[PDB]
Protein backbone atom coordinates (compact mmCIF):
# COMPACT_ATOMS: atom_id res chain seq x y z
CA UNK A 1 0.00 0.00 0.00
CA UNK A 2 0.85 3.76 -0.24
CA UNK A 3 1.90 5.91 2.82
CA UNK A 4 -0.52 5.73 5.83
CA UNK A 5 0.43 8.50 8.32
CA UNK A 6 0.90 6.25 11.35
CA UNK A 7 4.64 7.04 11.54
CA UNK A 8 6.34 10.05 9.93
CA UNK A 9 8.80 9.30 7.13
CA UNK A 10 10.97 12.35 7.84
CA UNK A 11 11.63 14.26 11.04
CA UNK A 12 12.64 17.87 11.13
CA UNK A 13 13.95 19.91 13.99
CA UNK A 14 14.55 23.57 14.85
CA UNK A 15 15.11 25.79 17.93
CA UNK A 16 13.56 24.67 21.19
CA UNK A 17 9.93 25.78 21.41
CA UNK A 18 9.88 27.67 24.68
CA UNK A 19 6.15 28.32 24.17
CA UNK A 20 3.48 31.03 24.44
CA UNK A 21 4.02 33.56 27.17
CA UNK A 22 0.60 35.17 27.82
CA UNK A 23 0.26 35.61 31.60
CA UNK A 24 2.60 32.73 32.41
CA UNK A 25 5.30 33.54 34.95
CA UNK A 26 8.31 32.29 32.94
CA UNK A 27 10.46 32.21 36.10
CA UNK A 28 8.66 28.94 36.93
CA UNK A 29 9.33 27.19 33.60
CA UNK A 30 12.16 24.67 33.09
CA UNK A 31 14.28 24.74 29.93
CA UNK A 32 13.84 21.97 27.39
CA UNK A 33 14.69 18.33 28.04
CA UNK A 34 16.25 16.12 25.38
CA UNK A 35 14.82 15.43 21.93
CA UNK A 36 13.59 11.88 21.41
CA UNK A 37 14.03 10.70 17.82
CA UNK A 38 12.05 7.67 18.98
CA UNK A 39 8.98 9.65 20.06
CA UNK A 40 9.22 11.83 16.93
CA UNK A 41 8.35 8.97 14.61
CA UNK A 42 4.87 9.11 16.07
CA UNK A 43 4.37 12.46 17.79
CA UNK A 44 6.68 15.25 18.97
CA UNK A 45 10.43 14.77 19.66
CA UNK A 46 10.73 17.70 22.08
CA UNK A 47 10.59 17.00 25.82
CA UNK A 48 9.74 19.99 28.04
CA UNK A 49 9.69 22.61 29.19
CA UNK A 50 7.46 21.92 32.19
CA UNK A 51 6.08 24.49 34.62
CA UNK A 52 7.09 24.32 38.32
CA UNK A 53 5.31 26.66 40.66
CA UNK A 54 4.29 26.14 44.27
CA UNK A 55 1.20 23.99 43.63
CA UNK A 56 3.27 22.01 41.12
CA UNK A 57 5.81 21.32 43.88
CA UNK A 58 3.18 20.66 46.59
CA UNK A 59 1.32 18.18 44.35
CA UNK A 60 4.46 16.43 43.23
CA UNK A 61 5.78 16.15 46.81
CA UNK A 62 2.47 14.96 48.22
CA UNK A 63 2.21 12.47 45.37
CA UNK A 64 5.60 10.91 46.12
CA UNK A 65 4.72 10.93 49.82
CA UNK A 66 1.66 8.81 48.95
CA UNK A 67 3.69 6.44 46.81
CA UNK A 68 6.35 6.14 49.50
CA UNK A 69 3.93 5.46 52.36
CA UNK A 70 2.49 2.57 50.34
CA UNK A 71 6.02 1.44 49.48
CA UNK A 72 7.39 1.56 53.05
CA UNK A 73 4.47 -0.60 54.11
CA UNK A 74 5.26 -2.97 51.23
CA UNK A 75 8.91 -3.40 52.29
CA UNK A 76 7.75 -3.93 55.87
CA UNK A 77 5.30 -6.58 54.66
CA UNK A 78 8.18 -8.24 52.78
CA UNK A 79 10.01 -8.38 56.11
CA UNK A 80 12.58 -5.99 54.58
CA UNK A 81 13.76 -8.72 52.19
CA UNK A 82 14.45 -7.38 48.63
CA UNK A 83 13.91 -10.75 46.93
CA UNK A 84 10.55 -11.23 48.71
CA UNK A 85 9.64 -7.66 47.76
CA UNK A 86 9.82 -8.33 44.01
CA UNK A 87 8.29 -11.77 44.45
CA UNK A 88 5.10 -10.69 46.21
CA UNK A 89 4.92 -7.16 44.71
CA UNK A 90 1.36 -7.51 43.38
CA UNK A 91 0.20 -9.29 46.56
CA UNK A 92 1.13 -6.58 49.03
CA UNK A 93 -1.71 -4.35 50.14
CA UNK A 94 -2.17 -1.31 52.39
CA UNK A 95 -5.66 -1.76 53.84
CA UNK A 96 -8.06 0.76 55.42
CA UNK A 97 -9.06 0.62 59.15
CA UNK A 98 -11.36 -2.22 60.20
CA UNK A 99 -15.14 -1.44 60.52
CA UNK A 100 -14.95 -1.05 64.33
CA UNK A 101 -13.01 2.20 64.02
CA UNK A 102 -15.86 3.70 62.00
CA UNK A 103 -14.77 7.07 60.65
CA UNK A 104 -12.34 7.88 63.47
CA UNK A 105 -8.61 8.59 63.01
CA UNK A 106 -7.82 6.52 66.13
CA UNK A 107 -6.88 3.36 64.18
CA UNK A 108 -3.30 2.19 64.95
CA UNK A 109 -0.50 2.65 62.41
CA UNK A 110 -0.24 -1.00 61.32
CA UNK A 111 -3.99 -1.41 61.42
CA UNK A 112 -5.45 1.42 59.32
CA UNK A 113 -3.67 4.65 60.24
CA UNK A 114 -1.01 4.28 57.59
CA UNK A 115 -3.78 3.89 54.96
CA UNK A 116 -5.25 7.19 56.22
CA UNK A 117 -1.90 8.99 56.04
CA UNK A 118 -1.43 7.73 52.46
CA UNK A 119 -5.03 8.75 51.69
CA UNK A 120 -4.22 12.24 53.07
CA UNK A 121 -1.21 12.61 50.77
CA UNK A 122 -3.33 11.41 47.86
CA UNK A 123 -6.17 13.81 48.59
CA UNK A 124 -3.77 16.78 48.50
CA UNK A 125 -1.77 15.55 45.50
CA UNK A 126 -4.91 15.22 43.33
CA UNK A 127 -6.88 18.35 44.29
CA UNK A 128 -3.74 20.45 44.05
CA UNK A 129 -3.05 18.90 40.63
CA UNK A 130 -6.62 19.94 39.69
CA UNK A 131 -5.99 23.57 40.73
CA UNK A 132 -3.01 23.16 38.43
CA UNK A 133 -5.12 22.18 35.37
CA UNK A 134 -7.20 25.30 36.02
CA UNK A 135 -4.40 27.84 36.72
CA UNK A 136 -2.30 26.66 33.74
CA UNK A 137 -5.26 27.28 31.43
CA UNK A 138 -5.98 30.61 33.14
CA UNK A 139 -2.39 31.81 32.76
CA UNK A 140 -2.79 31.18 29.03
CA UNK A 141 -6.27 32.73 28.72
CA UNK A 142 -7.85 29.40 27.67
CA UNK A 143 -11.17 27.89 28.58
CA UNK A 144 -11.42 25.73 31.68
CA UNK A 145 -12.43 22.56 29.82
CA UNK A 146 -9.57 20.38 31.06
CA UNK A 147 -10.18 21.22 34.70
CA UNK A 148 -13.85 20.65 33.96
CA UNK A 149 -13.25 17.14 32.46
CA UNK A 150 -10.72 16.21 35.18
CA UNK A 151 -13.51 16.87 37.70
CA UNK A 152 -15.45 13.87 36.33
CA UNK A 153 -12.56 11.47 37.02
CA UNK A 154 -12.05 13.15 40.41
CA UNK A 155 -15.77 12.49 41.09
CA UNK A 156 -15.46 8.70 40.77
CA UNK A 157 -12.24 8.69 42.78
CA UNK A 158 -13.82 10.85 45.48
CA UNK A 159 -16.85 8.61 45.62
CA UNK A 160 -14.77 5.42 45.93
CA UNK A 161 -12.29 6.60 48.62
CA UNK A 162 -14.02 9.42 50.48
CA UNK A 163 -17.72 10.24 49.91
CA UNK A 164 -19.05 6.66 50.03
CA UNK A 165 -17.05 5.61 53.14
CA UNK A 166 -18.26 8.78 54.92
CA UNK A 167 -21.84 8.07 53.88
CA UNK A 168 -21.49 4.35 54.72
CA UNK A 169 -20.20 5.34 58.16
CA UNK A 170 -16.72 3.72 58.05
CA UNK A 171 -13.33 3.87 56.23
CA UNK A 172 -13.36 0.07 55.85
CA UNK A 173 -15.61 0.61 52.83
CA UNK A 174 -12.73 2.22 50.89
CA UNK A 175 -10.23 0.88 48.36
CA UNK A 176 -6.95 -0.83 49.40
CA UNK A 177 -3.67 0.34 47.90
CA UNK A 178 -2.44 -2.71 45.98
CA UNK A 179 -2.36 -4.25 42.52
CA UNK A 180 -4.16 -7.56 43.09
CA UNK A 181 -6.10 -6.38 46.15
CA UNK A 182 -7.86 -3.49 44.35
CA UNK A 183 -9.10 -6.00 41.78
CA UNK A 184 -10.37 -8.28 44.61
CA UNK A 185 -12.11 -5.25 46.13
CA UNK A 186 -13.68 -4.55 42.75
CA UNK A 187 -14.98 -8.11 42.39
CA UNK A 188 -16.24 -8.24 46.00
CA UNK A 189 -18.01 -4.88 45.71
CA UNK A 190 -20.10 -6.24 42.83
CA UNK A 191 -20.81 -9.60 44.55
CA UNK A 192 -21.86 -7.89 47.77
CA UNK A 193 -24.22 -5.50 45.89
CA UNK A 194 -26.14 -8.10 43.92
CA UNK A 195 -24.04 -7.92 40.80
CA UNK A 196 -23.30 -4.50 39.27
CA UNK A 197 -24.70 -5.65 35.90
CA UNK A 198 -28.08 -4.78 37.38
CA UNK A 199 -26.94 -1.27 38.23
CA UNK A 200 -28.33 0.93 35.41
CA UNK A 201 -25.50 3.43 35.96
CA UNK A 202 -22.87 0.61 35.59
CA UNK A 203 -24.56 -0.13 32.23
CA UNK A 204 -24.42 3.47 31.07
CA UNK A 205 -20.85 3.75 32.26
CA UNK A 206 -20.00 0.75 30.08
CA UNK A 207 -21.84 2.33 27.10
CA UNK A 208 -19.67 5.44 27.37
CA UNK A 209 -16.42 3.51 27.94
CA UNK A 210 -17.10 1.41 24.84
CA UNK A 211 -18.48 4.63 23.26
CA UNK A 212 -15.13 6.36 23.84
CA UNK A 213 -13.26 3.60 22.07
CA UNK A 214 -15.77 3.82 19.16
CA UNK A 215 -15.56 7.61 19.01
CA UNK A 216 -11.77 7.99 19.34
CA UNK A 217 -11.40 5.22 16.79
CA UNK A 218 -13.82 7.09 14.46
CA UNK A 219 -12.30 10.57 15.12
CA UNK A 220 -8.67 9.42 15.07
CA UNK A 221 -9.20 7.50 11.85
CA UNK A 222 -11.17 10.37 10.23
CA UNK A 223 -8.49 13.00 10.94
CA UNK A 224 -5.70 10.73 9.62
CA UNK A 225 -7.82 9.95 6.50
CA UNK A 226 -8.13 13.70 5.79
CA UNK A 227 -4.62 14.62 7.01
CA UNK A 228 -3.65 14.82 3.34
CA UNK A 229 -5.82 17.99 3.27
CA UNK A 230 -4.43 19.38 6.50
CA UNK A 231 -7.23 17.92 8.62
CA UNK A 232 -5.23 17.72 11.89
CA UNK A 233 -5.00 21.51 12.00
CA UNK A 234 -8.33 21.43 13.80
CA UNK A 235 -8.47 25.02 15.10
CA UNK A 236 -7.89 26.67 11.68
CA UNK A 237 -10.46 24.29 10.23
CA UNK A 238 -12.86 25.54 12.96
CA UNK A 239 -12.15 29.18 12.09
CA UNK A 240 -12.07 28.60 8.30
CA UNK A 241 -13.61 25.31 7.14
CA UNK A 242 -11.53 23.57 4.44
CA UNK A 243 -11.95 20.59 2.13
CA UNK A 244 -10.60 18.35 4.97
CA UNK A 245 -13.50 19.21 7.29
CA UNK A 246 -15.98 18.88 4.44
CA UNK A 247 -14.76 15.45 3.23
CA UNK A 248 -14.76 14.35 6.92
CA UNK A 249 -18.37 15.39 7.48
CA UNK A 250 -19.52 13.95 4.20
CA UNK A 251 -17.91 10.59 4.90
CA UNK A 252 -20.11 10.21 7.97
CA UNK A 253 -23.20 11.79 6.44
CA UNK A 254 -22.97 9.38 3.50
CA UNK A 255 -22.31 6.49 5.87
CA UNK A 256 -24.81 6.96 8.68
CA UNK A 257 -26.93 9.93 7.51
CA UNK A 258 -25.62 12.62 9.88
CA UNK A 259 -22.34 14.22 10.79
CA UNK A 260 -20.42 16.58 12.98
CA UNK A 261 -18.41 19.76 12.54
CA UNK A 262 -14.71 20.27 13.26
CA UNK A 263 -15.57 21.97 16.61
CA UNK A 264 -18.67 19.95 17.50
CA UNK A 265 -16.90 16.56 17.28
CA UNK A 266 -14.67 17.65 20.14
CA UNK A 267 -17.88 18.24 22.15
CA UNK A 268 -19.15 14.70 21.43
CA UNK A 269 -15.65 13.60 22.54
CA UNK A 270 -15.48 15.46 25.78
CA UNK A 271 -18.95 14.30 26.75
CA UNK A 272 -18.54 10.63 25.73
CA UNK A 273 -15.49 10.49 28.01
CA UNK A 274 -16.66 12.44 31.04
CA UNK A 275 -19.92 10.51 31.07
CA UNK A 276 -17.98 7.33 31.93
CA UNK A 277 -16.92 8.54 35.37
CA UNK A 278 -19.95 10.76 35.77
CA UNK A 279 -22.51 7.94 35.62
CA UNK A 280 -20.02 5.54 37.22
CA UNK A 281 -19.62 7.72 40.30
CA UNK A 282 -23.41 7.88 40.71
CA UNK A 283 -23.70 4.12 40.32
CA UNK A 284 -21.14 3.51 43.09
CA UNK A 285 -22.39 6.33 45.33
CA UNK A 286 -25.89 4.80 45.39
CA UNK A 287 -24.56 1.33 46.17
CA UNK A 288 -24.99 0.36 49.81
CA UNK A 289 -26.18 3.89 50.64
CA UNK A 290 -29.55 3.65 48.91
CA UNK A 291 -29.55 0.28 47.09
CA UNK A 292 -28.33 -2.94 48.78
CA UNK A 293 -28.93 -5.30 45.97
CA UNK A 294 -29.13 -4.06 42.38
CA UNK A 295 -30.86 -7.29 41.27
CA UNK A 296 -33.51 -6.70 43.91
CA UNK A 297 -33.82 -3.02 42.96
CA UNK A 298 -34.18 -4.05 39.32
CA UNK A 299 -37.02 -6.42 40.14
CA UNK A 300 -39.08 -3.58 41.57
CA UNK A 301 -37.86 -1.68 38.45
CA UNK A 302 -36.91 0.84 41.14
Amino acid sequence: AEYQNIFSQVQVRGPADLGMTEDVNLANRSGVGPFSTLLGWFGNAQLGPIYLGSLGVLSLFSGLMWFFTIGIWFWYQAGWNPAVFLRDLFFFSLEPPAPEYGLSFAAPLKEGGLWLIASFFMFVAVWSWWGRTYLRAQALGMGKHTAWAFLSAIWLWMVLGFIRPILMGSWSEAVPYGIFSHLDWTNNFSLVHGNLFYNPFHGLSIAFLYGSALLFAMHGATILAVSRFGGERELEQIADRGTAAERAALFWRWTMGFNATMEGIHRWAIWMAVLVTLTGGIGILLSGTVVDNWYVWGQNHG
Partner: protein
Amino acid sequence: ALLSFERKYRVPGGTLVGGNLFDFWVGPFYVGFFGVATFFFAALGIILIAWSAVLQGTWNPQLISVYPPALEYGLGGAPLAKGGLWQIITICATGAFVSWALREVEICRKLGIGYHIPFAFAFAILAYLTLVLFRPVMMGAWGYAFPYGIWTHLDWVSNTGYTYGNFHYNPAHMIAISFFFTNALALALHGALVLSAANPEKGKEMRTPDHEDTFFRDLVGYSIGTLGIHRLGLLLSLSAVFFSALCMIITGTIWFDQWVDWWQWWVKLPWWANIPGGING
Protein backbone atom coordinates in the same frame (compact mmCIF):
# COMPACT_ATOMS: atom_id res chain seq x y z
CA ALA B 1 -31.11 16.77 1.36
CA LEU B 2 -27.63 18.24 0.70
CA LEU B 3 -25.28 20.14 3.00
CA SER B 4 -24.46 23.61 1.72
CA PHE B 5 -21.05 22.39 0.39
CA GLU B 6 -21.98 18.85 -0.62
CA ARG B 7 -22.77 19.03 -4.34
CA LYS B 8 -19.15 19.38 -5.63
CA TYR B 9 -18.36 16.02 -3.98
CA ARG B 10 -21.31 14.09 -5.43
CA VAL B 11 -19.53 12.99 -8.66
CA PRO B 12 -19.74 9.57 -10.32
CA GLY B 13 -17.19 6.82 -9.54
CA GLY B 14 -15.31 5.02 -6.80
CA THR B 15 -17.51 1.96 -6.59
CA LEU B 16 -15.96 -1.51 -6.18
CA VAL B 17 -18.68 -3.60 -7.80
CA GLY B 18 -21.29 -2.90 -10.49
CA GLY B 19 -19.88 0.28 -12.10
CA ASN B 20 -22.68 2.85 -11.87
CA LEU B 21 -25.66 0.53 -11.15
CA PHE B 22 -25.92 1.52 -7.51
CA ASP B 23 -23.95 4.74 -7.73
CA PHE B 24 -26.52 7.06 -6.13
CA TRP B 25 -27.83 8.34 -2.74
CA VAL B 26 -31.09 8.15 -0.78
CA GLY B 27 -31.39 11.43 1.12
CA PRO B 28 -28.03 11.77 2.97
CA PHE B 29 -27.23 8.04 2.57
CA TYR B 30 -24.83 6.70 -0.06
CA VAL B 31 -25.93 3.37 -1.49
CA GLY B 32 -23.57 1.45 -3.82
CA PHE B 33 -23.40 -2.32 -4.20
CA PHE B 34 -22.59 -2.74 -0.51
CA GLY B 35 -25.39 -0.41 0.55
CA VAL B 36 -27.65 -2.93 -1.17
CA ALA B 37 -25.83 -5.96 0.31
CA THR B 38 -26.06 -4.36 3.79
CA PHE B 39 -29.81 -3.92 3.45
CA PHE B 40 -30.25 -7.53 2.31
CA PHE B 41 -28.20 -9.06 5.16
CA ALA B 42 -29.59 -6.73 7.81
CA ALA B 43 -33.22 -7.22 6.72
CA LEU B 44 -32.86 -11.01 6.56
CA GLY B 45 -31.23 -10.96 9.96
CA ILE B 46 -33.95 -8.81 11.47
CA ILE B 47 -36.74 -10.96 9.92
CA LEU B 48 -35.04 -14.07 11.31
CA ILE B 49 -34.85 -12.41 14.77
CA ALA B 50 -38.59 -11.55 14.53
CA TRP B 51 -39.35 -15.14 13.62
CA SER B 52 -37.22 -16.29 16.49
CA ALA B 53 -39.26 -13.97 18.74
CA VAL B 54 -42.54 -15.54 17.54
CA LEU B 55 -41.21 -19.07 18.20
CA GLN B 56 -39.83 -17.90 21.55
CA GLY B 57 -43.36 -16.46 22.04
CA THR B 58 -42.55 -12.84 22.94
CA TRP B 59 -42.36 -9.32 21.43
CA ASN B 60 -40.72 -7.69 24.46
CA PRO B 61 -37.19 -6.42 23.58
CA GLN B 62 -36.05 -7.17 27.16
CA LEU B 63 -37.03 -10.82 26.67
CA ILE B 64 -36.24 -11.79 23.09
CA SER B 65 -33.07 -13.82 23.11
CA VAL B 66 -31.54 -15.95 20.37
CA TYR B 67 -29.31 -18.75 21.77
CA PRO B 68 -26.68 -20.74 19.84
CA PRO B 69 -26.89 -24.56 19.55
CA ALA B 70 -26.28 -26.51 22.79
CA LEU B 71 -22.74 -27.95 23.15
CA GLU B 72 -23.89 -31.46 22.11
CA TYR B 73 -24.28 -30.12 18.54
CA GLY B 74 -20.55 -29.38 18.37
CA LEU B 75 -19.85 -27.54 15.11
CA GLY B 76 -22.78 -29.01 13.15
CA GLY B 77 -26.05 -27.33 12.11
CA ALA B 78 -28.78 -27.31 14.73
CA PRO B 79 -32.50 -27.46 14.01
CA LEU B 80 -33.76 -23.93 13.31
CA ALA B 81 -35.53 -23.62 16.68
CA LYS B 82 -32.71 -25.22 18.68
CA GLY B 83 -29.88 -22.91 17.61
CA GLY B 84 -30.06 -22.95 13.79
CA LEU B 85 -31.64 -19.48 13.67
CA TRP B 86 -28.70 -18.22 15.75
CA GLN B 87 -26.44 -19.71 13.12
CA ILE B 88 -28.13 -18.00 10.14
CA ILE B 89 -28.49 -14.71 11.99
CA THR B 90 -24.70 -14.88 12.69
CA ILE B 91 -24.02 -15.33 8.96
CA CYS B 92 -26.32 -12.35 8.28
CA ALA B 93 -24.63 -10.15 10.91
CA THR B 94 -21.18 -10.82 9.50
CA GLY B 95 -22.62 -10.17 6.02
CA ALA B 96 -23.94 -6.83 7.25
CA PHE B 97 -20.77 -5.76 9.15
CA VAL B 98 -18.40 -6.69 6.30
CA SER B 99 -20.77 -5.03 3.78
CA TRP B 100 -20.90 -1.91 5.90
CA ALA B 101 -17.10 -1.72 5.88
CA LEU B 102 -16.83 -2.27 2.13
CA ARG B 103 -19.43 0.48 1.58
CA GLU B 104 -17.19 2.71 3.67
CA VAL B 105 -14.34 1.90 1.29
CA GLU B 106 -16.51 2.96 -1.67
CA ILE B 107 -17.26 6.24 0.09
CA CYS B 108 -13.51 6.75 0.73
CA ARG B 109 -12.80 6.24 -2.90
CA LYS B 110 -15.45 8.72 -3.97
CA LEU B 111 -14.12 11.32 -1.51
CA GLY B 112 -10.41 10.86 -2.26
CA ILE B 113 -9.63 10.16 1.47
CA GLY B 114 -7.59 7.53 3.34
CA TYR B 115 -8.99 4.09 4.25
CA HIS B 116 -8.41 4.43 8.01
CA ILE B 117 -12.08 4.35 9.09
CA PRO B 118 -13.13 0.97 7.58
CA PHE B 119 -9.76 -0.47 8.64
CA ALA B 120 -10.45 0.62 12.23
CA PHE B 121 -13.96 -0.78 12.04
CA ALA B 122 -12.43 -4.10 10.86
CA PHE B 123 -10.95 -4.50 14.40
CA ALA B 124 -14.46 -4.31 15.86
CA ILE B 125 -15.66 -6.93 13.40
CA LEU B 126 -12.70 -9.18 14.27
CA ALA B 127 -13.58 -8.96 17.99
CA TYR B 128 -17.14 -9.93 17.13
CA LEU B 129 -15.87 -12.80 15.00
CA THR B 130 -13.58 -13.88 17.85
CA LEU B 131 -16.51 -14.36 20.22
CA VAL B 132 -18.90 -16.03 17.71
CA LEU B 133 -16.65 -17.75 15.21
CA PHE B 134 -12.95 -18.14 16.07
CA ARG B 135 -13.13 -19.05 19.72
CA PRO B 136 -16.09 -21.47 19.37
CA VAL B 137 -14.43 -23.18 16.41
CA MET B 138 -11.22 -23.53 18.43
CA MET B 139 -13.18 -24.89 21.41
CA GLY B 140 -15.17 -27.37 19.33
CA ALA B 141 -18.71 -25.92 19.75
CA TRP B 142 -21.05 -23.14 18.60
CA GLY B 143 -22.56 -23.21 22.10
CA TYR B 144 -19.59 -21.28 23.44
CA ALA B 145 -20.69 -18.16 21.54
CA PHE B 146 -22.81 -15.51 23.24
CA PRO B 147 -26.61 -15.39 22.81
CA TYR B 148 -28.32 -12.44 21.04
CA GLY B 149 -30.36 -10.81 23.76
CA ILE B 150 -29.99 -7.58 25.71
CA TRP B 151 -29.84 -9.24 29.13
CA THR B 152 -28.89 -12.81 28.23
CA HIS B 153 -25.69 -11.57 26.51
CA LEU B 154 -24.72 -10.22 29.93
CA ASP B 155 -25.47 -13.62 31.62
CA TRP B 156 -22.95 -15.11 29.17
CA VAL B 157 -20.36 -12.51 30.08
CA SER B 158 -20.76 -13.32 33.76
CA ASN B 159 -20.84 -17.10 33.39
CA THR B 160 -17.91 -17.15 31.02
CA GLY B 161 -15.94 -14.84 33.28
CA TYR B 162 -16.57 -16.77 36.48
CA THR B 163 -15.80 -20.11 34.78
CA TYR B 164 -12.18 -19.08 35.23
CA GLY B 165 -12.56 -17.54 38.65
CA ASN B 166 -12.16 -13.76 38.79
CA PHE B 167 -11.52 -12.76 35.16
CA HIS B 168 -9.49 -9.82 36.39
CA TYR B 169 -6.48 -12.16 36.55
CA ASN B 170 -6.41 -12.81 32.77
CA PRO B 171 -3.17 -10.87 32.01
CA ALA B 172 -4.28 -10.00 28.43
CA HIS B 173 -7.59 -8.62 29.90
CA MET B 174 -5.47 -6.33 32.12
CA ILE B 175 -3.66 -4.85 29.14
CA ALA B 176 -7.00 -4.46 27.31
CA ILE B 177 -8.70 -2.68 30.22
CA SER B 178 -5.65 -0.39 30.38
CA PHE B 179 -5.99 0.70 26.79
CA PHE B 180 -9.75 1.30 27.37
CA PHE B 181 -9.14 3.45 30.45
CA THR B 182 -6.24 5.29 28.77
CA ASN B 183 -8.38 5.91 25.65
CA ALA B 184 -11.20 7.46 27.66
CA LEU B 185 -8.59 9.64 29.40
CA ALA B 186 -7.07 10.78 26.10
CA LEU B 187 -10.53 11.42 24.54
CA ALA B 188 -11.46 13.65 27.49
CA LEU B 189 -8.15 15.53 27.11
CA HIS B 190 -8.11 15.89 23.34
CA GLY B 191 -11.67 17.12 23.48
CA ALA B 192 -11.00 19.51 26.36
CA LEU B 193 -7.80 20.74 24.82
CA VAL B 194 -9.24 21.71 21.42
CA LEU B 195 -12.34 23.28 22.98
CA SER B 196 -10.27 25.27 25.55
CA ALA B 197 -8.43 26.89 22.66
CA ALA B 198 -11.44 27.40 20.37
CA ASN B 199 -13.39 28.80 23.31
CA PRO B 200 -11.00 30.95 25.38
CA GLU B 201 -11.70 33.20 28.36
CA LYS B 202 -14.59 35.65 27.66
CA GLY B 203 -13.62 38.31 25.10
CA LYS B 204 -10.16 36.89 24.27
CA GLU B 205 -9.08 35.81 20.83
CA MET B 206 -9.16 32.12 19.90
CA ARG B 207 -5.92 30.48 21.07
CA THR B 208 -3.63 28.63 18.63
CA PRO B 209 -2.06 25.14 18.44
CA ASP B 210 1.05 26.76 19.99
CA HIS B 211 -1.17 27.48 23.03
CA GLU B 212 -2.27 23.82 23.08
CA ASP B 213 1.33 22.57 23.03
CA THR B 214 2.20 25.22 25.62
CA PHE B 215 -0.67 24.24 27.90
CA PHE B 216 0.23 20.58 27.93
CA ARG B 217 4.02 21.04 28.18
CA ASP B 218 3.27 23.36 31.01
CA LEU B 219 1.10 20.76 32.73
CA VAL B 220 3.14 17.56 32.25
CA GLY B 221 6.26 18.53 30.30
CA TYR B 222 5.26 16.91 27.03
CA SER B 223 2.87 17.47 24.16
CA ILE B 224 2.33 14.75 21.57
CA GLY B 225 1.24 17.28 18.93
CA THR B 226 -1.86 17.37 16.74
CA LEU B 227 -1.02 14.62 14.33
CA GLY B 228 0.20 12.54 17.33
CA ILE B 229 -2.99 12.79 19.40
CA HIS B 230 -5.09 11.58 16.50
CA ARG B 231 -2.55 8.73 15.92
CA LEU B 232 -2.71 8.12 19.68
CA GLY B 233 -6.49 7.75 20.01
CA LEU B 234 -6.55 5.50 16.98
CA LEU B 235 -3.76 3.34 18.52
CA LEU B 236 -5.19 3.28 22.04
CA SER B 237 -8.68 2.18 20.99
CA LEU B 238 -7.57 -0.26 18.31
CA SER B 239 -5.15 -1.78 20.89
CA ALA B 240 -7.90 -2.05 23.50
CA VAL B 241 -9.89 -4.17 21.08
CA PHE B 242 -6.91 -6.18 19.90
CA PHE B 243 -6.07 -7.25 23.43
CA SER B 244 -9.77 -7.85 24.10
CA ALA B 245 -9.86 -10.38 21.25
CA LEU B 246 -6.52 -11.90 22.44
CA CYS B 247 -7.69 -12.24 26.00
CA MET B 248 -10.63 -14.38 24.85
CA ILE B 249 -9.07 -16.33 22.00
CA ILE B 250 -6.73 -17.72 24.70
CA THR B 251 -9.47 -18.46 27.28
CA GLY B 252 -10.82 -22.00 27.04
CA THR B 253 -8.10 -22.93 24.56
CA ILE B 254 -4.49 -22.45 25.66
CA TRP B 255 -5.49 -21.61 29.23
CA PHE B 256 -8.64 -22.98 30.87
CA ASP B 257 -8.06 -23.12 34.59
CA GLN B 258 -8.50 -20.33 37.13
CA TRP B 259 -6.70 -17.21 35.78
CA VAL B 260 -5.55 -16.30 39.29
CA ASP B 261 -3.28 -19.44 39.26
CA TRP B 262 -1.40 -18.34 36.12
CA TRP B 263 0.35 -15.82 38.33
CA GLN B 264 1.94 -18.66 40.30
CA TRP B 265 4.83 -19.07 37.80
CA TRP B 266 6.35 -15.80 39.03
CA VAL B 267 6.06 -16.65 42.74
CA LYS B 268 7.48 -20.15 42.20
CA LEU B 269 10.68 -19.02 40.49
CA PRO B 270 13.62 -21.00 42.03
CA TRP B 271 15.65 -18.07 43.44
CA TRP B 272 12.87 -16.78 45.81
CA ALA B 273 10.19 -19.45 45.63
CA ASN B 274 11.27 -20.69 49.05
CA ILE B 275 12.38 -17.57 50.98
CA PRO B 276 10.01 -17.13 53.96
CA GLY B 277 8.07 -13.95 54.89
CA GLY B 278 5.90 -11.66 52.76
CA ILE B 279 2.48 -12.83 51.57
CA ASN B 280 3.39 -16.07 49.85
CA GLY B 281 5.88 -17.35 52.44
